Amino acid sequence: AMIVKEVYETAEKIKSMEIRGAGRIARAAAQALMIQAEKSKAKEPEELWNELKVASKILYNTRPTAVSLPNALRYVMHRVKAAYLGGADLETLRFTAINSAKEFIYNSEKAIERIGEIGAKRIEDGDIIMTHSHSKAAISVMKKAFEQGKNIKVIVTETRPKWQGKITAKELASYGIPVIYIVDSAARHYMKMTDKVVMGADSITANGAVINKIGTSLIALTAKEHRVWVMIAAETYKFHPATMLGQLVEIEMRDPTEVIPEEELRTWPKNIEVWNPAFDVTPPEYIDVIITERGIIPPYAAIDILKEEFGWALKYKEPWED
Amino acid sequence: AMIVKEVYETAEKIKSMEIRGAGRIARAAAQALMIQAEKSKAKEPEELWNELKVASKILYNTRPTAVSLPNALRYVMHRVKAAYLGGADLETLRFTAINSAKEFIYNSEKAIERIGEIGAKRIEDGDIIMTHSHSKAAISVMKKAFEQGKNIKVIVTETRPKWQGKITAKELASYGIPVIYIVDSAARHYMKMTDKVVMGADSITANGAVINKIGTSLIALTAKEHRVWVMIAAETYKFHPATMLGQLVEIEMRDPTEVIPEEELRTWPKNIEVWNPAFDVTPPEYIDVIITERGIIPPYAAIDILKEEFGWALKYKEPWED
Amino acid sequence: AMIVKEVYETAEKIKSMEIRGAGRIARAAAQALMIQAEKSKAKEPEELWNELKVASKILYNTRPTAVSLPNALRYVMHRVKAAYLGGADLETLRFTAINSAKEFIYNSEKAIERIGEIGAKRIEDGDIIMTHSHSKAAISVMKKAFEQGKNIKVIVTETRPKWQGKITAKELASYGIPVIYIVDSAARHYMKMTDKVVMGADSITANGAVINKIGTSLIALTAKEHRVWVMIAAETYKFHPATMLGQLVEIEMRDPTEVIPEEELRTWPKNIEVWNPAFDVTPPEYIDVIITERGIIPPYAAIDILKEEFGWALKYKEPWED
Amino acid sequence: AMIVKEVYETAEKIKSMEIRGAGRIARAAAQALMIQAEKSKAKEPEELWNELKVASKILYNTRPTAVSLPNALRYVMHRVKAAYLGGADLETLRFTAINSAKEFIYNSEKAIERIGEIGAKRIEDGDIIMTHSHSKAAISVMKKAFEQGKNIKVIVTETRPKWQGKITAKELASYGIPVIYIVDSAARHYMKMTDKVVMGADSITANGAVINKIGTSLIALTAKEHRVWVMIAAETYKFHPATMLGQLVEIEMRDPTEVIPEEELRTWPKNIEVWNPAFDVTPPEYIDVIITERGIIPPYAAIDILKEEFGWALKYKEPWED
Amino acid sequence: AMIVKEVYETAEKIKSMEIRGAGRIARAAAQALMIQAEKSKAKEPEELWNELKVASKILYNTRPTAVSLPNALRYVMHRVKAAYLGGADLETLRFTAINSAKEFIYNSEKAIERIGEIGAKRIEDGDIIMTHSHSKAAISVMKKAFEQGKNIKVIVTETRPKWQGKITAKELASYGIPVIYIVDSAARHYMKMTDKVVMGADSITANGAVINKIGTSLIALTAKEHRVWVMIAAETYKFHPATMLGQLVEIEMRDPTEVIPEEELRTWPKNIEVWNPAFDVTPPEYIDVIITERGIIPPYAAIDILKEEFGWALKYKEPWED
Amino acid sequence: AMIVKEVYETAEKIKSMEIRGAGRIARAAAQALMIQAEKSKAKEPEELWNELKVASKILYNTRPTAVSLPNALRYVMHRVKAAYLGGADLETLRFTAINSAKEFIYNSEKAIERIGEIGAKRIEDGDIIMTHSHSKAAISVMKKAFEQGKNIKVIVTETRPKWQGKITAKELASYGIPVIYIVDSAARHYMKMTDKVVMGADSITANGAVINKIGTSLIALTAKEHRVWVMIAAETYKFHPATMLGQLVEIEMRDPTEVIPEEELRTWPKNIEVWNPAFDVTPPEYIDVIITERGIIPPYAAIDILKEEFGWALKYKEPWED
Ligand SMILES: Nc1ncnc2c1ncn2[C@@H]1O[C@H](COP(=O)(O)O)[C@@H](O)[C@H]1O
Ligand SMILES: O=P(O)(O)OC[C@H]1O[C@H](OP(=O)(O)O)[C@H](O)[C@@H]1O
Ligand SMILES: O=P(O)(O)OC[C@H]1O[C@H](OP(=O)(O)O)[C@H](O)[C@@H]1O
Ligand SMILES: O=P(O)(O)OC[C@H]1O[C@H](OP(=O)(O)O)[C@H](O)[C@@H]1O
Ligand SMILES: O=P(O)(O)OC[C@H]1O[C@H](OP(=O)(O)O)[C@H](O)[C@@H]1O
Ligand SMILES: O=P(O)(O)OC[C@H]1O[C@H](OP(=O)(O)O)[C@H](O)[C@@H]1O
Ligand SMILES: [K+]
Ligand SMILES: [K+]
Ligand SMILES: [K+]
């Protein structure tokens, strides 16, 4: 109930997409629990516990699709709950929250570096890589492959409505990587000159399906058509535990004004609806490998990743639950 | 040569895409040769012949990909050239041109209403139709189905870079037709709820291939993946003669600042190139039917349409050449 | 208005499927106009003309899907109308009707013999042929191939709900042809031992799509999956002229009691609906050749067949129209 | 050996398909070994051991294709065999058998309710579900989605030769669920209006393949053609151990008179054979998920389910052998 | 009965593949007929007519698969037979033969030249072209493209068993075209670097299937897999008139010593059979265009080449027949 | 530094392909290490350890593509290195090496035997089997099946460039198995008569792709096209641990004189380059099963073979490294 404003700002910024990208939203949420814990004026363990739960709920209710966010909160809160129910004093519980958040953040960073190291080995001298949206994990791969001295070019799709491709383009450019910027529509037209595809992931399912920025499935489709390897770069905390037990991932429908700006949209007739899904789902047949910090896998081994790391917790309710 | 201003203004406006759509471009090309003949001050027939030769060369060098443009110029100038070589005096030559051009414009209008009526019979009540870009022909089909009392909805894809989807959305919505506007990247995500795809053409080749707005081949591809019918609404003047003798269609590369505005692009790193192809090429196997003013065809019958309407002219030179 | 009962019985028998099969229904309808004409008590040409029109309407309104029926009636009635409007006396008009019907019947028979002769050449010694429903044209092929001394076996699908396969099985057996009878569901399971598929057609469209007995499209689908040639055996009067101008073929929905017998069906809860489509539509991609009396064609050449034989009449209303 | 009558009556009833469905067969197999142990008059443990050995051999030789049967027998007899070899006295051996069998029956029931709850989460409100044959597991999924308030309709395919579709149609309709009954041949025609396919399994192989009622592979095939999800509701006791070591599953050929009744078939020509396979084999690539009581898997994870639940037993002999 | 030396040498050189390549073979058979007429010591019309009839049969009975050969003998003998039946005297008949063969040969050289010109237009600067066997018409395309100043590289598949690829590689090298030579099995491995596939044909059928050197089908298949264009370079006398009326093309089975040499094969166990198909059949779905001397067709328009250039003769027997 | 004669002969025999076949090569490298330890005149532990390290590098540097080789050197040197670091004396170290090589070699012979037994079960009486190259493990399957009394026939693809298929054909003949020998290009032509495809592997990756003799991929592709099962017979030491961490397998490019002999190649134009890839890569989607000595897997479970038998060593450097 005495929730610090750093939690409230992180939430608003997640919603507004000032903080965006699956890994980043996750790190931002770990962070927010950290700050809440650091700054809490609680006197009993029970008071802090309550704050961490209510803050976790606020943070969870921001954006649904990327499972990295709930996974970050679970990492922190599985540990916090266990300390709490085990009778931890106020300070043991504060540190358990703070240090758990710190680990997630630190492991998130090492996981992305490691993915780049692993992914890069699948890039070859002279490769033309097509990507989509802005993925820290995808970019780690392309960036490392350049640093090894491979001469790559990267086709960057624009990624409407939010123009994520601009970010990716400028960022790749600044590491010395040449870029070809194209609109989303042109992905089939350039698939013939493309040697590899490398994209990120918001959530990966028990069957190997990849939920990622709207348009990912199209690029994968025509990549398959063309026999261009589709490689997805993704941390194990992108894997979705609830889909083990039959859960479908919700696809976020964002405001129509991200597609068509406010001033214009209200001049339009009432019988036009603008629909703005932030993600689509890419079937496993169309994915060559998923690149995790633990190694290369075929998409269908998503279940192993889920079994050995996340399944244990599916008997329990969420660690923030009241 | 004394070229009248309406010839130059039309060429500017085609190049700038102020005038756009392969059907319109073609009518305006004819309209321009008509205005040249109307206002010419030529004394001799040879004087006027030369004006129209040159006028045609100006118009032909505007935009290369939609063969409708040269087929309009040809429709007028084969006639003008035969009048002139067969000894026509001046005012005979002036009317051959005027009248040939009025013929093309009125047949063009006719063909579109006719493609509407034919193509509508392949629209079923309840259908959800996905379309791309803005095509007077495709719209004729959708609008004619609506006027028949069928309850349709049209999925209008945005169509970057130039936003042609906005024109389409507003146009259809203004005839009463419910519209759903989405980004091009959302085509696959919404292909499951789509019953029919209806699109235009700029060029159609001997072998069946359809050159139409960039992103057309993606929509068609994922329509095939899902067994949604891809119907191309296209006049016979969209069919490309030189492809019979082995020609590939030039795919127009338009200025990059149509993608990223000048103000923003000049601030971007030197090693990003923006590539802006205006069109892509959809293979025949992803096309179900081509709705011409002469009836429904399989796309492989493109060659029949060309054999019987264009072949004769191929042993000759272009009717505006020296 | 003074319509003979032979017209009324032929109609009832077409509806009830006592007379069934596309070619046969067509011959039966030609026949019926013949008898009407033979037995008419008309005294003026105008009186007979009226009878032939009203009889054509009755016969046309029996079953929609197989276009052979309207084509048979057009063959007879294009000729009758032309005699009539050209001032034929009563007897000239009677004979025009009678003799036209006779030609259609005679040409129908020669067309089926000729298809068998042509089709059989595509069967090879040792072939295992899978078929579907009961097609006179298909059977003509298999029968001729045996008579040439090729040792074939024919897999006969049962063809529910009406058990057409029983007819085909007994009929092939009686020519010396060994038969393997299987239920419809088993077609994929036996496609591996199948060398050829040979089926009939009720209506063939401008784009090469084949409308035929329910389940045809499944057999073709898994045939394609397996690279087994799908050959359709079909007379040129199976080709559908209205689909040139964008008409979709109606798919006949027959009584639910053909699926589930009356005594049983009325014991069932109201919230079960039985749906009984008599046909499905098979796309051209899944058809290797159509075998007509005029020769082997790829499915997509359906338009040539339609252009050169049926298109001339599409400017006119139906020759029975009032 | 003194085999009790309920062992023989159950074997007759499995063979005749009076008792049917791989789940039921398996429970009744266990039920029979339970009744044998209940009523045995054995004095020694060795006497009873031998009765159960023989009882198991009788039950195992009824119907070969659904591995659920032997997995039930194994579940009981690995336990009984270990009790006996580990010196158990008589009434200990009698209870090991009884209790092992009650265990299997109650776990089987549990697994089905559980597969209902998991699989329902992949059913979305509004969905039209196509199913095949009659599967308690598939029905558990569909019924559980309905109880959640989702408005579904189920397309029940008839399922020749034995008409299992009638059982399914009546069952689902009796829980309130709207049913559409069609013939197996209509599967493709109605795949366009279908959102999800839900079916059972009799055996599932190491590599992912699903053996289920004849016609299953057709439905799955055309589901893939249209990108409709194929979900297999199947317990872990449906998974086939011997396939790990290279075994192919025997596909049961049932008496031809189930297709064509004795009265009719005896009148048919000698060179028609009726072939009645009871099952077909659907490849893994046409399967989206397998819903087990342990959660959603990709079909290629069949091998994991077998490794961790069945592999150990493969170096041993069958637990009812000499 | 009095057949010239040359007809025998031509025949034998064709049998042993000393003269080879569909077009060349046909030229050699026209040449033979031409020399039979030149050197005839016949004095009656009927004596010559009989020499030419027999000469034809000898030639037609060398090698079955390439229809070019009978199409050449028909070109000559149709004309010879029309003259002989007109009552043409000896010297008129002798010239009919002599001239018709020269007309055939000259039109053949012209077609291959024109195919080069037309086909070259579909080659683009920087293209890598995979070919197969040695096709004069395929080579015309490649050579003309290279002469146009396009920097192409050609991948020459070795083409077992007769090592045809060595001839192709040496030939293209000799015009200054960089060749990559590879074994047949490597065609998929290098399909990713291939932009275009260009190959010949021995026979093209009524449905658009292409019969060419063994392996042609594997290359078309993996080319389709990767969306590389397959372009067939083929004179209109490669199209097979018999296939219109149902015939299948005979696939010539040549000597096993062309595979395993005689000195080695004789030492091998009896129970190894060496099979040497000289050709295979590529379906039209894997073929993008056929480049003929009349233009570009989709494979499905082969029926038109046939309808319009050959169908007239099918009514009749082969000209050389009695 | 003091390396035995035999290590050099083994190395050179492997380089020149005198010793060939992935499994055999590996046995030859274990053998070499075994003879280095046997014949060492070293007197300190460290002297031997250094001989074996160097011997290993020599061997690993012969042929890159078949991972069996390093997996054998690892089997031995992991064990040798654990001993040397335990402080093992000279003779203990010498035995560690000698025994570990014998263990490797004996386990290899056992695996190939067990693969035969397991793989044979998926062969059925009357099967026609296409194979490629010469794989000891593929042959084990075929031989065991034939020994079981199944009347099989084997199609042996010739396998250029090194004529591997002659070895296979002679070998299978020698066990009494009828062979059909065909050139590589004929694999599609005979895929219709093929029931089963059985081939070896040199390296199998973490995502299930198979690296085997050049051509393997063309056969898998057309086998998939026709729904023929592709079964790979492969010892678990064919699985590539490096591919888990991102590596690509190096495709060995061997001498051009293995393609075109030296006496002939030297006469050829400079501008023909002869490319000799010894291997290609088959994707997992075209592979039905991998038959290992631990059982049948889908190709996607290759990651499990790896996770569980090799992943432990990836943390560390190669045993022979300093
Ligand atoms: N050198 C290599 N090492 C490991 N995997 C490879 C290599 N080359 C190709 N692949 C894989 O092999 C398959 C190639 O398939 P395609 O893209 O269809 O050629 C894919 O599954 C790739 O991941
Ligand atoms: O974790 P990293 O690799 O940064 O990003 C993964 C994915 O998350 C992003 O979505 P959004 O911008 O949050 O809507 C993009 O879809 C991207 O592919
Ligand atoms: O001729 P209509 O049917 O109106 O449209 C035909 C096509 O021409 C347009 O190109 P652009 O906007 O001129 O670049 C669009 O691609 C459209 O589909
Ligand atoms: O075990 P449950 O899930 O109820 O059904 C599993 C399968 O077993 C049945 O076979 P049969 O009717 O015994 O021949 C059907 O094929 C059904 O899908
Ligand atoms: O007429 P051109 O285009 O030269 O060759 C056509 C085809 O004929 C040849 O066969 P063969 O060498 O006669 O056995 C080759 O297969 C070639 O592709
Ligand atoms: O171990 P086994 O199963 O015998 O053979 C495995 C594979 O290794 C061989 O290559 P190479 O002859 O070494 O170049 C063949 O390609 C074969 O399929
Ligand atoms: K590419
Ligand atoms: K749809
Ligand atoms: K659907």
Collect all residues of chain A within an 8 Å Cβ-Cβ radius of residue D297: 206-207, 303
- Longest pairwise C-alpha distance within chain A: 64
Residue A20, Ramachandran bin (φ over 0: left; ψ between -120 and 50: alpha; else beta): beta
**CA–CA distance, C6 with E25 (Å, rounded to integer):** 63
Task: Decide if F300 contacts A300 (C-beta within 8 A).
Answer: yes
For residues B23 and B237, give the distance between their C-alpha atoms in angstroms, rounded to a whole number. 9
| Residue F269 per-residue DSSP state | -
Q: Measured between alpha carbons, how far is residue A240 from residues A67, A303, C13, D75, D298 in Å?
A: 6, 9, 61, 33, 14
Please confirm whether the linkage preceding F319 is cis (ω < 30° from 0): no
| F238 close to F203: Cβ distance less than 8 angstroms | yes
C225: which chain F residues are within 8 Å (Cβ-Cβ)? 227
Give the helix ranges, DSSP H, for C17-65. 22-39, 45-60
- The CA E24 to ligand 5 mean position distance, Å, reads 8
Q: Is D261 near chain C, with CB under 8 Å?
A: no
Query: Chain A: residue nearest D290 by CA?
Result: A207
* Interchain contact A/C (3 or more Cβ pairs less than 8 Å): no
Ligand 5 site residues (CB inside 6 A) read E 20-25, 66, 133, 135-137, 199-202, 212-213, 278
* Nearest bound ligand to the CA of residue E116: 5
**B281 DSSP β-pair partners:** B211
Report the distance separating Cα A215 and Cα C9, nearest Å: 60
Copy the structure tokens of residue A74.
Answer: 């679970």
Phi, psi at residue E9, to the nearest 5°?
-65, -45
CA dist D146 and D127 (Å) reads: 10
Q: Is the CB of A189 inside 8 Å of chain E's CB atoms?
A: no
> Does residue B45 have a cis peptide bond before it, meaning omega lies within 30 degrees of 0?
no
Method used to solve the structure: X-ray
CATH of domain C1-109+311-322: 1.20.120.420
Q: Which ligand is in closest contact with the Cα of B202?
A: 3
User: CA-CA distance, B308 to C302, in Å (whole number)?
Assistant: 17
* Domain coordinates in residue numbering, chain D: 1-109+311-322, 110-310
Contact E145, E117 (CB under 8 A): no
Q: Per the structure block, which two tokens stand in for B191?
A: 């292909």
Q: Does D305 touch chain F (CB under 8 A)?
A: no
Alpha carbons B126 and D157: distance in angstroms, whole number: 25
Q: Is F209 in the pocket of ligand 1 (CB under 6 A)?
A: yes
Q: Is the CB of D70 under 6 A from ligand 4?
A: no
Determine contact: A186 vs chain B, CB below 8 A: yes
Count of Cβ atoms closer than 10 Å to residue A126 Cβ: 10
- Contact criterion met (CB below 8 Å) for F131 and F138: yes
Mapping DSSP to helix (H, G, I), strand (E, B) and coil, where does residue F261 land? coil
Query: What share of residues in chain B are helix, strand, coil (percent, to 5)?
Result: 50, 15, 35
Between the CA of A37 and the centroid of ligand 2 the distance, in Å, is 27
Q: Is D264 helix (H, G, I), strand (E, B) or coil?
A: helix
Question: By the CB < 8 Å criterion, does A303 face chain B?
Answer: no
Backbone angles phi, psi at E283, to 5 degrees: -75, 155
From CA B66, how far away is CA B29, in angstroms rounded?
Answer: 12
Q: Which CATH number fits domain E110-310: 3.40.630.10, 3.40.50.10470, 2.120.10.30, 3.40.50.720?
A: 3.40.50.10470
DSSP string for F246-259: TPPPP--B--GGGT
Q: Do E259 and F161 touch (CB under 8 A)?
A: no
Q: What is the resolution of this structure in A?
A: 2.8
Q: Which residues of chain C does E246 touch, with a Cβ-Cβ cutoff of 8 Å?
A: 117-122, 291, 295-296
Distance CA D15, CA D3 (A): 18
Cα separation values, D93 from B183, D1, D26, D39, Å? 69, 17, 21, 13
**Chain Cα centroid distance, residue E79:** 22
What gap in Å lies between CA D70 and CA C104, rounded to an integer? 64
Pocket test residue of E19, E65, E163, E212 for ligand 5, highest count of atoms within 8 A of CB: E212
Question: How does DSSP assign B194-247, residue by residue?
Answer: -SEEEE--SEE-TTS-EEEETTHHHHHHHHHHTT-EEEEE--GGGB-GGGGGTP
Compute the distance from residue F289 Cα to the ligand 7 centre, in Å.
28
Among all chains, which residue has been given the structure tokens 């399994």? Answer: D201
Is residue C233 within 8 angstroms of chain E, CB to CB?
A: no
DSSP state of B277: B
Q: Which residues contact B133 (CB under 8 A, 6 or more apart)?
A: B157, B159, B164, B165, B168, B199, B200, B212, B213, B215, B216
What SS3 state is found at F176?
Answer: coil
For residues F141 and E259, give the distance between their C-alpha atoms in angstroms, rounded to a whole number.
27
Residue F202 distance to chain D (closest CA, Å): 21
Q: How far is CA F257 from the centre of its chain?
A: 23
Q: B209 in ligand 3 pocket by Cβ < 6 Å?
A: no
Q: Look up residue C230 and give its two tokens.
A: 């799908």
- What is the DSSP-derived secondary structure letter of residue F130? E
Listed in sequence order, the residues at least 6 apart from A109 whose beta carbon sits closer than 8 Å to its beta carbon are none
Q: Which ligand is nearest to the CA of F280?
A: 1
Q: In what order do the strands lie in the sheet with B128-131?
A: A272-274, B179-182, B153-157, B128-131, B196-199, B229-233, B289-292, B295-297
**Residue D268 near residue D260 (C-beta atoms within 8 A):** yes
- Interface membership of D124 toward B (CB under 8 Å): no
Task: Tell me the C-alpha distance between B113 and B131, whole Å.
Answer: 18
Q: Tell me the shortest Cα–Cα distance from C177 to chain E, in angstroms.
A: 21
DSSP state of F184: G
Judge residue E13's burial from the number of C-beta atoms within 10 Å of its C-beta, 0-12 exposed, 13-18 middle, 19 or more buried. Answer: middle
Q: How many residues does chain E have?
A: 322
How far B223 CA lies from chain D's nearest CA (Å)?
A: 10
**Do the chains contact at C296 and E248, CB–CB below 8 Å?**
no
Q: How far is CA B65 from CA A186, B12, B61, B167, in A?
A: 16, 16, 11, 21
CB distance A108 to ligand 2 below 6 Å: no
List C-alpha distances in Å: F138 to D294, F162, F200, F217: 36, 18, 5, 16
Q: Which chains neighbour C (Cβ–Cβ under 8 Å, 3 or more pairs)?
A: B, D, E, F
